[PDB]
Scaffold this motif. Structure first.
Motif, PDB file in Angstrom:
ATOM      1  N   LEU A  70       0.842  -1.188   0.000  1.00 36.61           N
ATOM      2  CA  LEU A  70       0.000   0.000   0.000  1.00 36.61           C
ATOM      3  C   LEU A  70       0.891   1.257   0.000  1.00 36.61           C
ATOM      4  O   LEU A  70       0.580   2.221  -0.703  1.00 36.61           O
ATOM      5  N   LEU A  71       2.011   1.224   0.760  1.00 33.71           N
ATOM      6  CA  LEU A  71       2.995   2.311   0.824  1.00 33.71           C
ATOM      7  C   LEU A  71       3.696   2.473  -0.519  1.00 33.71           C
ATOM      8  O   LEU A  71       4.078   3.585  -0.870  1.00 33.71           O
ATOM      9  N   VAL A  72       3.892   1.352  -1.242  1.00 32.64           N
ATOM     10  CA  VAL A  72       4.530   1.292  -2.560  1.00 32.64           C
ATOM     11  C   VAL A  72       3.579   1.888  -3.617  1.00 32.64           C
ATOM     12  O   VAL A  72       4.047   2.537  -4.557  1.00 32.64           O
ATOM     13  N   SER A  73       2.246   1.701  -3.435  1.00 37.98           N
ATOM     14  CA  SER A  73       1.203   2.260  -4.309  1.00 37.98           C
ATOM     15  C   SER A  73       1.180   3.771  -4.106  1.00 37.98           C
ATOM     16  O   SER A  73       1.020   4.531  -5.062  1.00 37.98           O
ATOM     17  N   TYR A  74       1.404   4.191  -2.849  1.00 43.78           N
ATOM     18  CA  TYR A  74       1.542   5.572  -2.410  1.00 43.78           C
ATOM     19  C   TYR A  74       3.005   5.955  -2.711  1.00 43.78           C
ATOM     20  O   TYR A  74       3.768   5.094  -3.155  1.00 43.78           O
ATOM     21  N   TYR A  75       3.398   7.228  -2.491  1.00 44.87           N
ATOM     22  CA  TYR A  75       4.764   7.722  -2.738  1.00 44.87           C
ATOM     23  C   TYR A  75       5.261   7.324  -4.150  1.00 44.87           C
ATOM     24  O   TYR A  75       6.242   6.590  -4.298  1.00 44.87           O
ATOM     25  N   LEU A  79      14.487   1.712   0.754  1.00 47.00           N
ATOM     26  CA  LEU A  79      14.123   1.940  -0.637  1.00 47.00           C
ATOM     27  C   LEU A  79      13.166   3.134  -0.806  1.00 47.00           C
ATOM     28  O   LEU A  79      13.475   4.040  -1.583  1.00 47.00           O
ATOM     29  N   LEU A  80      12.027   3.143  -0.082  1.00 51.90           N
ATOM     30  CA  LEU A  80      11.072   4.254  -0.128  1.00 51.90           C
ATOM     31  C   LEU A  80      11.563   5.330   0.838  1.00 51.90           C
ATOM     32  O   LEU A  80      11.578   5.112   2.052  1.00 51.90           O
TER      33      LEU A  80
END
Ligand code: SF4
Ligand code: SF4
Ligand code: SF4
Lengths: 79, 118, 369, 88, 143, 325
Positions: A73-78, B72-73
């Motif tokens: 979900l964080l990867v879909s975001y940012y 990574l993020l």
């Protein structure tokens, strides 16, 4: 029992003292899942024989799914 | 006899200090390391099989993923051994089937959330 | 995202400071820059030993093109046994350059055993380099071949070839080495001709200065056509490995005359070869010492004689004003065509893939300038 | 007083633990379908780790229900690779 | 003191285990390749110090040296640890004179042992290695 | 408890010495394949190379000029603890190492996850610079093959049952190694070289973007080789299990009762050493005869081919056990 309850408390207070962070809340939710399990496992040993330890493994699977889901979900975001 | 084993309540003294350290820690890097330490403290409490079950999944995969996403993020801001299988595979076989179903969504979900395929 | 591919030691030693703008998950945006590293100031004879220090491995073949370029400008160049000691040695220094190039590729591409197996055989060739020289001159060669030169070639000729099939059997018959080299190498043929490629760098797909219009004594000896199926790094290596066997099959078919024949060049001037009777034939001493002191003059005219060496097209642009030494000397080398072809070819691969490009492309810091 | 004592290998480790920049350009990447491999490791590692207690508890049960779980997970690895692959 | 040997015990172990860095520039680089091959496979064994050079102590400058390569050589010695030793292989590094190539590597990095030759043979560099090994043993006396 | 403190020390001394000596062994065996020679000058026999390399880095210098200079030194310590704690659960007979834990198999799996955790703390230090995203590629490669070992672990337990390593070795007595798993043995060896740092896969993790703790990283690395090598031995190969049927014949000829002449504990250890040394040797010629893979080719070899293949093997293993029981 008293250990897992205190872990749940501090984590719930730490969640509502986030300081915007976002990443802190994910760590907090995971530790709350750990807190519930420790009090259930203590009850499982107190009662004796597999019944509570079964539901404890169920939470471990759902928490693992919850972490993998919330992190994607964080990867879909940012973006 | 065995005064250290009776004073092993130190787990609650360590957990309260460890959890107050996850909040106080500046940068998530330290907070995840302290989450691993808190789970290792809980694993040490399960000596008072689930310790090794937790280290393999919670510390082994969940915590590894928690560290893999932050690096990574960018984001940032300031007669058998306990069995279990006897009930889950026979009695709670409906829940065993649904636990495979919850695991379908576990890998199919991110595939329909972060894809962008042609 | 941008990175500088090795400030030094990138593949073997290199030195090259390749500013590769590595875009998201390695796609490559090439910006080489580098091109780091007297021939005018020094005399025509003085320029020759200073010339070979470009491509260190194929130094004897590097000497040959400059020797032929001075020969064409002089318009006097007919040795016989002195011409036989050029095709043999030119296809001996070819083994040396092809060893270093294949081994430098294998060094970074895991396989460290063929890398050392290469340098092991090289020591047997060092006897052919030390005992004879201490080499290729415009007026022939530095000196005569020893008695233990032709009498003992079989010690190398039979022991090598089977060892060539130990390096080949370790690379060609693979999955790991094969899948990568087949995918990499953007040899688009027409654009590769536009980029000015040469030798195993352009004849990999199936396109030669060594053949058709050949340079001294190479004309008579047999040469087979290197096929090459696709335009990729695997075929490029296969061509170099076919050239390895080609460099051995020539020596046996070129093993003719050698002891007792044509010394260097016959006349007073252009490197005097008496040695024993130089004191009795003293009327040529005024000529002998003059080649070292002032130097003999050459006719004025623009000349360019390109010769395909082991690396590729090594071409010398010897232009003289009329003086002893030529006015300007230009080196159109394949190592300079490397950096010129790095962009577009490597553009569309990955970072570990960008290392294996150099191995087939062949790079020497000296030869680049 | 203690059994095996693992800490006697930890103590020498603790004891041993106690006892301008140039050359390159830096300071200044998102690999996209690479995080998903890690995100997928968590449930895939769970899948095999959850099978472990059923693997231990054999020769007491009927394997048909034990096989069903794996078939559902086979449909998944298929439902992943045929749809999007490893993403080159 | 009597037990002066402990100062040399580290030295004998240092000269036999030292890890040299391949600063291969041109012709000398491949003479060094022949050295680090089946010749110096007994006590040398060191390489890979580009990733560092915090790791490896002996700096072998092998090859030619351009006027633009000067800030790179200076930085390698700066990024190197305190027990650093230097070896100058080749005529270009020793003293080849040009306007695009610097006259000497001594102006950039101070060298302990100089190895002459163009290119210095497999035996030539190996001897220069043993001379620097003798310098590590605290026996540097005027011959 | 003087009986137990001396017992651990002699085991730890031999293990650390064997780990250090392999650095010389790998150096000499690779030399023979390359036609050259290994170390000769050092020591007297050429065997003192490992100690000389370790002593050289003990003098060295500090890496003080920092990004949590405590965290950068935490990683080589965490790799050492997991390696040494991994050894306390590798027995060879009734109870050779005290870690005769009632759930021995999971102890190896709990550690095999920490060797991944410590890996992303290593190249982490000093920002995104010098490829932090390049160091994370190694840890993503690590988790992929970590799943393969666990999938092979459950496969062995599916055949013999019980989470004890001692019981796993005892059941394999009839067939030495787990024979209906020969391709899976090669798969576990391919995953053995893949999980730990061996040139195929070590080159992808340590050779790419321009690439005191050195005596640790290499110690834990070589420890991880022999650890996963012997670790493979008890799962498949079958340690202790030397001569079959002709074992009882030789022993009962000149021993009478049993006596303090415990040859049992010596023959077994010599057989296991050969089991792991042959695998260690196999780990050395793979350095020689093998090229290198690309990161994208690594995951494609595991997640696309190796994972669905193993999925089928453990799917049919109870169905093929259903018929014969
Ligand atoms: S060089 Fe000197 S001696 Fe010789 S010819 Fe001329 S003058 Fe006569
Ligand atoms: S002529 Fe003599 S002095 Fe000049 S380089 Fe040749 S060797 Fe040195
Ligand atoms: S010294 Fe001579 S040998 Fe070394 S690089 Fe310079 S030119 Fe080559």
């Amino acid at each position: 029992m008293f250990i897992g309850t205190i872990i749940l408390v501090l984590s719930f207070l730490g969640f509502v003292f986030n300081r915007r962070n976002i990443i802190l809340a994910f760590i907090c939710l995971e530790t709350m899942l750990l807190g519930i399990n420790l009090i259930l496992l203590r009850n499982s040993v107190l009662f004796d024989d597999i019944s509570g330890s079964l539901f404890a493994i169920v939470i471990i699977i759902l928490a693992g799914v919850e972490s993998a889901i919330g992190l994607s979900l964080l990867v879909s975001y940012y973006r | 006899x065995x005064x250290x084993x009776x004073x092993x309540x130190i787990t609650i003294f360590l957990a309260i200090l460890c959890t107050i350290f996850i909040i106080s820690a500046k940068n998530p890097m330290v907070s995840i390391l302290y989450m691993i330490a808190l789970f290792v403290i809980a694993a040490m409490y399960l000596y008072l099989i689930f310790s090794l079950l937790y280290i393999m999944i919670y510390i082994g995969a969940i915590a590894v993923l928690f560290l893999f996403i932050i690096t990574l993020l960018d984001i940032n801001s300031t007669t058998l051994l306990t069995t279990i299988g006897n009930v889950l595979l026979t009695n709670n076989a409906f829940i065993l089937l649904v636990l495979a179903i919850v695991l379908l969504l576990g890998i199919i979900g991110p595939i329909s959330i972060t894809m962008k395929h042609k | 995202f941008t990175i500088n591919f090795g400030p030094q030691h990138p593949a073997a030693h290199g030195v090259l400071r390749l500013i590769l703008e590595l875009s998201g998950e390695e796609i490559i945006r090439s910006d080489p820059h580098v091109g780091l590293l007297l021939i005018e100031y020094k005399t025509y004879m003085q320029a020759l030993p200073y010339f070979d220090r470009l491509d260190y491995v194929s130094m004897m073949t590097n000497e040959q093109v400059f020797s032929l370029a001075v020969e064409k400008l002089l318009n006097v160049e007919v040795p016989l046994r002195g011409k036989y000691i050029r095709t043999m040695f030119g296809e001996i220094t070819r083994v040396l350059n092809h060893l270093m190039s294949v081994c430098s590729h294998a060094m970074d591409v895991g396989a460290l055993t063929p890398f050392l197996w290469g340098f092991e055989e090289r020591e047997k060739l060092m006897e052919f380099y030390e005992r004879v020289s201490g080499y290729v001159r415009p007026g022939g060669v530095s000196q005569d071949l020893p008695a233990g030169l032709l009498d003992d070639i079989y010690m190398w000729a039979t022991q090598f070839g089977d060892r060539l099939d130990e390096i080949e059997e370790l690379l060609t018959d693979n999955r790991i080495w094969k899948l990568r080299t087949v995918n990499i190498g953007t040899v688009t043929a027409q654009d590769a001709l536009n980029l000015g490629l040469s030798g195993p760098m352009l004849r990999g797909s199936g396109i030669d200065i060594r053949k058709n219009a050949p340079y001294d004594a190479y004309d008579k000896v047999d040469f087979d056509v290197p096929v090459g199926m696709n335009g990729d790094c695997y075929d490029r290596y296969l061509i170099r490995m076919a050239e390895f066997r080609q460099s051995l099959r020539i020596i046996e078919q070129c093993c003719n005359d050698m002891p007792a024949g044509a010394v260097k060049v016959e006349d007073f001037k252009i490197n005097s070869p008496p040695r024993n009777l130089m004191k009795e034939d003293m009327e040529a001493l005024i000529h002998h010492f003059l080649l070292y002191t002032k130097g003999y003059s050459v006719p004025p005219g623009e000349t360019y004689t390109a010769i395909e060496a082991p690396k590729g097209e090594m071409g010398v642009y010897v232009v003289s004003d009329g003086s002893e030494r030529p006015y300007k000397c230009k080196i159109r080398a394949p190592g300079f065509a490397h950096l010129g072809a790095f962009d577009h070819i490597a553009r569309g691969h990955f970072l570990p893939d960008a290392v294996a490009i150099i191995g087939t492309m062949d790079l020497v810091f000296g030869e680049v300038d | 007083m203690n059994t095996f004592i693992i800490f006697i290998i930890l103590i020498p480790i603790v004891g041993f633990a106690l006892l301008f920049e140039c050359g390159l350009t830096s300071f200044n990447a998102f690999n996209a379908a690479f995080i998903l491999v890690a995100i997928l490791f968590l449930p895939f590692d769970l899948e095999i780790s959850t099978l472990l207690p059923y693997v231990m508890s054999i020769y007491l049960v009927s394997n048909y229900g034990f096989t069903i779980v794996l078939l559902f997970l086979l449909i998944l690895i298929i439902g992943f690779v045929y749809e999007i692959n490893t993403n080159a | 003191y009597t037990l002066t040997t402990l100062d040399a015990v580290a030295n004998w172990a240092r000269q036999g285990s030292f890890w040299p860095v391949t600063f291969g520039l041109a012709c000398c680089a491949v003479e060094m390749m022949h050295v680090s091959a089946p010749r110096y496979d007994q006590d040398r064994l060191g390489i890979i110090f580009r990733a560092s050079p915090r790791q490896s102590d002996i700096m072998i400058v092998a090859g030619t040296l351009t006027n633009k390569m000067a800030p790179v050589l200076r930085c390698v010695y700066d990024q190197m640890p305190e027990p650093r030793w230097v070896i100058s292989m080749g005529s270009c590094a020793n003293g080849h004179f040009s306007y695009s190539v610097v006259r000497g590597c001594d102006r950039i990095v101070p060298v302990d042992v100089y190895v002459p030759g163009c290119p210095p043979t497999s035996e030539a560099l190996m001897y220069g290695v043993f001379q620097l090994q003798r310098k590590m043993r605290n026996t540097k006396i005027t011959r | 408890m003087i009986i137990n403190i001396v017992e651990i020390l002699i085991f730890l001394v031999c293990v650390l010495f064997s780990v250090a000596y392999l650095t010389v062994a790998e150096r000499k065996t690779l030399a023979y394949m390359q036609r050259r020679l290994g170390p000769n000058f050092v020591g007297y026999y050429g065997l003192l190379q490992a100690f000389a390399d370790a002593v050289k880095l003990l003098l060295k210098e500090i890496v003080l000029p920092e990004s949590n200079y405590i965290i950068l030194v935490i990683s080589p310590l965490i790799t050492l603890i997991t390696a040494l704690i991994g050894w306390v659960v590798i027995p060879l007979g009734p109870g050779i190492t005290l870690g005769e834990l009632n759930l021995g198999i999971l102890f190896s799996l709990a550690i095999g996850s920490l060797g991944v955790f410590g890996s992303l703390l290593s190249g982490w230090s000093s920002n995104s610079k010098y490829s932090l995203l390049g160091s994370i590629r190694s840890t993503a490669q690590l988790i992929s093959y970590e799943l393969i070992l666990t999938s092979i672990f459950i496969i062995i337990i599916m055949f013999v049952s019980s989470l004890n390593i001692t019981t796993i070795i005892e059941t394999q007595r009839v067939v030495w190694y787990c024979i209906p798993l020969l391709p899976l043995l090669l798969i576990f060896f391919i995953a053995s070289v893949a999980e730990t740092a061996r040139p195929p896969f070590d080159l992808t993790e340590s050779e790419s973007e321009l690439v005191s703790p050195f005596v640790f990283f290499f110690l834990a690395e070589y420890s991880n080789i022999i650890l996963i090598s012997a670790f493979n031995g008890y799962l498949l190969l079958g340690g202790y299990l030397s001569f079959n049927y002709s074992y009882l014949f030789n022993i009962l000829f000149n021993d009478y009762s049993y006596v303090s002449f415990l040859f049992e504990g010596l023959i077994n250890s010599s057989a296991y050493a050969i089991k792991l040394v042959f695998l260690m040797f196999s780990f050395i010629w793979v350095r020689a005869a093998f090229p290198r893979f690309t990161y994208d080719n690594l995951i494609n070899f595991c997640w696309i081919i190796l994972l669905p293949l193993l999925f089928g093997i453990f799917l049919i293993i109870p169905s093929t056990l259903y018929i014969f029981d």
